[PDB]
Structure 1
């Protein structure tokens, strides 16, 4: 925010923000796939029990 002037300050902090949103999106997608795998494994324990 400090050095770059206002017209392209955004042309940079949107880059940062969408990059971090992409990182969060990747983490969330990985967690949804892993949770599906666990739920597949969790239902093989309810049946075994």
Structure 2
């Protein structure tokens, strides 16, 4: 039944890891959108008059 105990630990920790990974993916998508905006602004307003 120790193996049952480790089963409980495993499922809990794996669920926590999955939630963390999903949050990371969402935040990275947001950051990528902001980076695209920054690159467009830098190309259009620094290398030429907008």
Deviation sequence 1:19-49 (CA, Å, 0-9, x none): 1011111111000000000001110000000
Query: Which structure has the larger Rg over C-alpha atoms?
Result: 2
Q: What runs of 5+ residues in structure 2 fail to find an aligned partner?
A: 43-50
Shift of 1:15: 0.7
- Provide structure 1 residue ranges, at least 5 long, that are not aligned to the other structure: 1-7
- TM-score (normalizing by structure 2): 0.78
Q: Which has the higher contact order (CA 8 A, sep 6+)?
A: 1
TM-score, structure 1 normalization: 0.79
How many residue pairs match? The answer is 42
C-alpha RMSD over aligned residues = 0.7
